[PDB]
Design a protein around this ligand. Structure first.
Ligand SMILES: [K+]
Ligand SMILES: [Mg+2]
Ligand SMILES: [Mg+2]
Ligand SMILES: [Mg+2]
Ligand SMILES: [Mg+2]
Ligand SMILES: [Mg+2]
Ligand SMILES: [Mg+2]
Ligand SMILES: [Mg+2]
Ligand SMILES: [Mg+2]
Ligand SMILES: [Mg+2]
Ligand SMILES: [Mg+2]
Lengths: 337, 325, 208, 134, 132
RNA sequence: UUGGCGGUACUUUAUAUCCAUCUAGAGGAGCCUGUUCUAUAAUCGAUAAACCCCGCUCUACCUCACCAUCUCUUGCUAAUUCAGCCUAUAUACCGCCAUCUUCAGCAAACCCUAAAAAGGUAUUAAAGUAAGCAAAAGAAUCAAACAUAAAAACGUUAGGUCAAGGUGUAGCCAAUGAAAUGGGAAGAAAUGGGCUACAUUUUCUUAUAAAAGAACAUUACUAUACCCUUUAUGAAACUAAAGGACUAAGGAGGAUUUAGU
């Protein structure tokens, strides 16, 4: 009967069975059947002037007509091809880049942060993921509620970078919250000549030790995969780092920014001590290179040079220079970073 | 960042355009109804809209309206700073510039009265404005703690010596208390062709309705529906109910009543007459007596009426038996 | 209720309103002035200023009424008073001058003094402790004590009477027999008191 | 440091707790105020779980006297629990709660009325797989 | 819980229209009736026939204007005239509406033997009363 | 660090409710009706609270989905190797609901934290904020109130319903489909609900619930049963009503339970 026929929305609602007792506490896919239908087109192949064909053709007011059996079979086959092509389009997708692995979110770009209150675009900033946790708690809504905690980092590759944590029930929301929060906590990291840190940095943040080293050009980033991601956002091109103790991602991000943002530039050192800062490169011979001169008054008392320094040395650093064999894993051939 | 539409807020440019369309709307609505645009008013507009767009929706907020933008649009949506971004009021950054600007003025008045140095009941039968009324004057949302603090400050002002300026100020926040006098409204005293005085009043008990016609001078002859009262009311309790109004005022055998009761049963018809007689007898008694009648229940209509039966249960309150488990 | 809680019970005392203003206690005087700005409930159909209206007798009528048959219940009470007045007139006329003095012929005074004679001071409420039903002596309020006297009368007459006798003839014979402190209702009162004396020691087991 | 620092069996526990708390309230050991209240104890009822301990004290006629007695008794109930653990009456004692018992007033009432009575004559969603594809 | 004609709450992202937002108990209070005939008035006949004709007229207009209806249609019967008032989205070209109006009117006048007119108000997009 | 339940039995709390108080009932007899059981060749579903005069505001045929027997094979439609299908899964669902419930919560987007597994209050105020959903308000019961209706989010019970209808998956197409005829029975049985009576505040008669005249224990009260007639509906009386007699039991109903402010 014509009176027992229901609309498409109600037919798919029942068939999909998305809202149900099984679905909530524990595959059918929806389709649109009006996608390719052109108003005025039927199986019989009639041609309706003003609906599915031109109302006037070559100055002639058209009249009703019907397509031949051969012509209609072509049109039916053509639509079948277009439907089959549409299915192929659904399968096709533009592959985006993986991160540190193929099934992990760490290292994956998610674009720039959203515009600001007064149209402050951040197209020059890139966002990278560092950790994605799917944690479940115990709330009455589901008995065991769902939560997604996302740590992200942002940077323009020109010295400005920041990190934030975003939490939500949906992963997409946790990305937006973290991504837009980090733009409000931008550290500025001082780079020596735009490619490396000004000096060696050793620090302990909670139980995570980081040990960074200043390196010459062309050395590349030989660091923990998370440090490489952040260093690219900061703009550091050449550095070495070692991480020991706990590998907590948050302590490494907090510890990294803590150490990189508390480093002393050469210009600062000249002012603190009042002396010239001179540089000696082995590829330039004995030529002294003046990299920073005190802003105010140059002193005349030479800095005390002890016969034997009391510096606290790391066994790991010294061990190499003592002739001790390194591990089989050290200084392996790796892709360019 | 959600699909829910962004907060819809109105600028001064927007409301200004909404007031030009309303002004042009009136000139058209006036031309439709054949009235003069100059004199056309808010009252005529509302009447015209009701004729041209008849709606029988019970809730009147859902009916068609052509009102002035000030009424419909929330008033607390006006620009609070200029082009250069400098707010207009020095207390803008408090978030309650109007509440605190008022608390600033009242605290300054209090200080001058206390520094500079009779009965305080200049106004009687008045109340402090309720929070809803205050929020309207300030045009900003207030909390319950904010209202309590404002009243305590206004009270302190009254305690102190108050010049005529202060009395006018506190008057702004004093609203006349409703004077609903529960005093019976005496009926007129008409005159018959014979010239005798008589008053009439209606009464309703359950589904019964009565229309009594008490006469100032009589021997106690009560006629119900053109019949005597001993005949019409063979039950003793029904006659006693007719005796209650007169017996109370010691006026038995002094009035002649003619009643017409239609509807209800025997008891409901006697009660309907009792109220109708008590209300008509008011015109022939002193005001002190009328209050004595009101305080004995003789002048209050009885609101008790049969309640509807409910679906799924035997009666109005009776429930179907809870089947033995 | 269809009356909001602000409504006041009506006062239908004729003399109270007509008393001189000075004769009224200031507490009563205050209530009158307060009531002028308040709402009063309409008087009930059975509430009148009649001088013959007795609240106790009106209450006894309602406790005999069945299914809203007030005419029949009032008729039974009216016939009862008449049956008691006619029974005392017979005895009064058939008695010597000395006996005539004591005989009481007012039915309203025989009814009130009869009921009062059937009111129990103490009561027994049935409780369960330790898997058995232990009742305990209780002190009865003025309302519970009055209700029990009326209920016991309306129950002796309704049940323990011959099939052909009528309630105006059984109730009259019980009000008069109770009025002399010899009826069965009085015995019911004695039993209730007697049971309490037996259980006086075990009053401890009350929690209310 | 300091700021951070600061059937048959129930019959035996109910009776003994009553036997001991009566002694604590017969002297100023708890407090002089508690001594002056001259409080009497109807009974002690310990719950089955032992979460709390009910102490029924014979209420009086005056509401003001009872309201004051309640406040003073409750404030000292925590200290009273300490005294029973310290004297080694019971190793573990539940939080003592003080409950009223107005039966004593009723008990006197019955005798008065009874005497006057007339007896009468005798995974895929979580993973980036969907995202990476596009 | 009552499930009848209620668009249930989502998480603030479902755009319901004025008609959809209001549950049945607001009928005659906040929202009116989509069909207005004299067949349900007291002592009037042919309620069954008017109700059946409406059901068909609603299914016919949906199919004839598929995906072009912004809201439910409003049916107005005066004398023997039937009037169909529909809010239609501006998806189709203008001339296509002139065809569907001429077709749907003529077809429905020869099916129910009454004068039928179609009144179309075009909206730029569905009007959202609230987001639920 | 949280969530839970354990014996949360403790203090306040319920409000026609847990006990108490009050009124009329149920529990006994007779019937009416649903269910279970027995049972029949002979539906199905509901079946603790939240089933049991339930889907049915309604089964003599029809209704009908059941059973026996006989018959039809492109078998409702414009077309279709198609029509049709009350065939299985309500544990695939839509739809419409029960329930806690007139319970009070559900809370998106922002902001803050010496890192956050989470938390975010102080009013003589100390980091929270500006918006929704429910409640409230509003409207209905045709003045006014009150009351009653209606309203009551998210979850709980894979709660109920493939047999209102639609529908996913699987199954039948000379049969699990279509049609015709005749049947779909009963109780030394249990139980739920309703109805009537058991009487004197009653029975009958006239009025009318006023009053009066009679009856008033062996059939006086008391049969909506069985049986006997007439009548209404219908093609069909197997139905209903009205009389007629026949009249049996019942004498106010154990523990226990229902409703009412
Ligand atoms: K369902
Ligand atoms: Mg892989
Ligand atoms: Mg009833
Ligand atoms: Mg089932
Ligand atoms: Mg049949
Ligand atoms: Mg058949
Ligand atoms: Mg079949
Ligand atoms: Mg209202
Ligand atoms: Mg509401
Ligand atoms: Mg078959
Ligand atoms: Mg016939």
């Amino acid at each position: 009967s014509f009176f027992t026929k229901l609309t498409a929305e109600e037919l798919w609602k029942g068939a999909l069975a998305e809202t149900g007792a099984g679905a909530r506490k524990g595959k059918k896919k929806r389709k649109d059947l009006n996608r390719g239908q052109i108003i005025g087109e039927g199986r019989s192949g009639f041609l309706w002037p003003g609906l599915n064909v031109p109302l006037i053709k070559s100055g002639v007011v058209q009249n009703i007509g019907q397509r031949s059996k051969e012509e209609q079979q072509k049109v039916e086959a053509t639509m079948v091809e277009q439907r089959e092509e549409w299915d192929r389009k659904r399968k096709i997708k533009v592959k985006r880049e993986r991160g540190w692995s193929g099934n992990t979110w760490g290292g994956v770009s998610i674009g720039p942060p959203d515009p600001g209150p007064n149209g402050e675009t951040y197209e020059d900033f890139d966002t990278r993921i560092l950790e994605v946790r799917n944690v479940f708690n115990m709330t009455a809504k589901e008995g065991r509620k769902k939560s997604v905690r996302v740590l992200v980092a942002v940077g323009n590759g020109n010295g400005a970078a920041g990190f934030a944590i975003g939490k939500a029930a949906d992963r997409g929301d946790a990305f937006r919250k973290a991504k837009n929060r980090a733009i409000h906590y931008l550290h500025y990291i001082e780079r020596y000549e735009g490619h490396t840190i000004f000096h060696d940095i050793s620090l302990r943040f909670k139980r995570t030790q980081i040990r960074m080293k200043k390196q010459p050009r062309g050395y590349g980033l030989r660091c923990h995969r998370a440090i490489i991601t952040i260093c690219r956002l900061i703009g550091i091109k050449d550095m070495y780092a070692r991480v020991t103790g706990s590998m907590n991602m948050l302590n490494l991000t907090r510890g990294l920014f803590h150490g990189l943002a508390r480093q002393e530039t050469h210009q600062h050192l000249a002012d603190k001590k009042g002396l010239h800062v001179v540089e000696f490169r082995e590829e330039c011979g004995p030529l002294p290179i003046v990299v920073a001169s005190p802003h105010g008054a140059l002193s005349k008392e030479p800095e005390p040079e002890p016969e034997v320094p009391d510096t606290k040395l790391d066994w790991q650093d010294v061990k190499a220079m003592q002739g001790l064999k390194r591990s089989v894993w050290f200084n392996l051939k790796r892709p360019a970073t | 960042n959600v699909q829910a539409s962004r907060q819809e807020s109105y600028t001064e440019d927007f409301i200004k355009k909404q007031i030009e369309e309303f002004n042009i709307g009136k000139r058209h609505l006036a031309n439709m109804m054949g009235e003069d645009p100059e004199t056309f008013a808010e009252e005529d507009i509302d009447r015209a809209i009701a004729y041209l767009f008849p709606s029988g929706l019970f809730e009147k907020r859902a009916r068609p309206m052509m009102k002035h933008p000030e009424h419909i649009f929330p008033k607390q949506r006006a620009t609070q700073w200029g082009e250069d971004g400098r707010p207009f009021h020095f207390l803008f950054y408090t978030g309650k510039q109007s509440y605190y600007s008022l608390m600033h003025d009242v605290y300054g008045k209090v200080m001058q009265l206390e520094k500079h140095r009779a009965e305080s009941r200049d106004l009687i039968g008045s109340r402090w404005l309720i929070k809803e009324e205050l929020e309207e004057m300030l045009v900003e949302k207030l909390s319950d703690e904010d209202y309590a603090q404002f009243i305590r400050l206004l009270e302190k002002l009254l305690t102190l010596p108050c010049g005529p300026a202060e009395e006018e100020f506190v008057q702004r926040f004093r609203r006349s208390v409703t004077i609903q006098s529960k005093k019976q409204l005496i009926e007129p005293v008409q005159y018959d062709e014979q010239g005798m005085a008589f008053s009439t009043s209606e009464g309703r008990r359950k589904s019964a309705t009565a229309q009594a016609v008490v006469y100032e001078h009589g021997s106690g002859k009560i006629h119900v529906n053109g019949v005597d009262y001993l005949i019409y009311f063979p039950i003793t309790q029904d006659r006693e109910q007719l005796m209650f109004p007169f017996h109370f005022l010691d006026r038995l055998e002094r009035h002649d009543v003619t009643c017409t009761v239609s509807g209800g049963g025997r008891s409901a018809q006697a009660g309907a007459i009792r109220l109708a007689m008590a209300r008509a007898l008011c015109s022939f008694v002193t005001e002190d007596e009328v209050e004595w009648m009101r305080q004995a229940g003789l002048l209050t209509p009885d609101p008790r009426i049969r309640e509807r039966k409910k679906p799924g249960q035997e009666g109005a309150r009776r429930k179907f038996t809870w089947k033995k488990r | 209720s269809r009356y909001a809680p602000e409504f006041r019970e009506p006062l239908i005392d004729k003399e109270y309103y007509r008393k001189p203003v000075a004769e009224l206690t200031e507490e009563e005087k205050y209530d009158q002035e307060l009531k002028k700005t308040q709402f009063i409930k309409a008087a009930a159909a059975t509430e009148t200023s009649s001088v013959f209206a007795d609240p106790v007798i009106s209450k006894f009528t309602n406790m005999m009424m069945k299914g809203g048959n007030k005419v029949l219940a009032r008729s039974l009470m009216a016939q009862t008073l008449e049956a008691v007045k006619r029974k005392q007139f017979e005895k009064y006329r058939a008695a010597s001058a000395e006996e005539q003095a004591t005989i009481e012929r007012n039915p309203y005074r025989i009814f009130h003094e009869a009921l009062k004679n059937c009111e129990p001071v103490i009561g027994l409420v049935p409780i369960l402790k330790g898997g058995h039903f232990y009742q305990v002596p209780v002190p009865l309020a003025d309302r519970r004590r009055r209700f029990l006297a009326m209920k016991w009368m309306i129950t002796e007459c309704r049940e323990n009477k011959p099939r052909r006798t009528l309630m105006p003839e059984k109730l009259s014979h019980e009000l008069l027999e109770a009025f002399h402190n010899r009826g069965p209702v009085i015995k019911r009162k004695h039993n209730m008191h007697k049971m309490a004396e037996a259980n006086r020691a075990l009053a401890h087991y009350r929690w209310w | 440091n300091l700021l951070k620092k600061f059937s048959i069996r129930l019959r035996v526990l109910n009776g003994l707790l009553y036997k001991s708390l009566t002694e604590l309230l017969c002297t100023p050991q708890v407090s002089q105020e508690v001594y002056d209240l001259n409080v009497e104890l109807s009974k002690v009822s310990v719950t089955s779980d032992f979460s709390a301990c009910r102490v029924y004290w014979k209420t009086g006629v005056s509401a003001e006297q009872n309201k004051h007695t309640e406040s003073v008794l409750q404030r000292s109930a925590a200290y009273m629990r300490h005294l029973l653990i310290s004297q080694q009456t019971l190793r573990n004692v539940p939080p003592i709660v003080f409950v009223q018992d107005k039966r004593d007033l009723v008990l006197a009432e019955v005798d008065r009325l009874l005497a006057e009575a007339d007896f009468g004559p005798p995974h895929r969603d979580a993973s980036p797989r969907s995202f990476l594809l596009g | 819980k009552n499930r009848a004609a209620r668009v249930r709450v989502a998480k603030g992202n479902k755009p319901v229209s004025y008609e959809e937002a209001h549950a049945p108990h607001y009928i005659a209070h906040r929202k009116g009736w989509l069909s207005l005939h004299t067949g349900n008035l007291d002592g009037e006949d042919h309620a069954a026939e008017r109700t059946l004709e409406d059901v068909f007229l609603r299914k016919f207009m949906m199919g004839t204007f598929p995906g072009c209806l912004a809201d439910q249609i409003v049916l107005k019967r005066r004398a023997n005239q039937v009037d169909i008032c529909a809010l239609v989205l501006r998806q189709l070209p203008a001339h296509k509406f002139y065809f569907l109006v001429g077709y749907s009117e003529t077809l429905l006048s020869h099916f129910y033997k009454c004068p039928v007119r179609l009144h179309l108000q075009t909206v730029p997009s569905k009007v959202v009363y609230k987001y639920i």
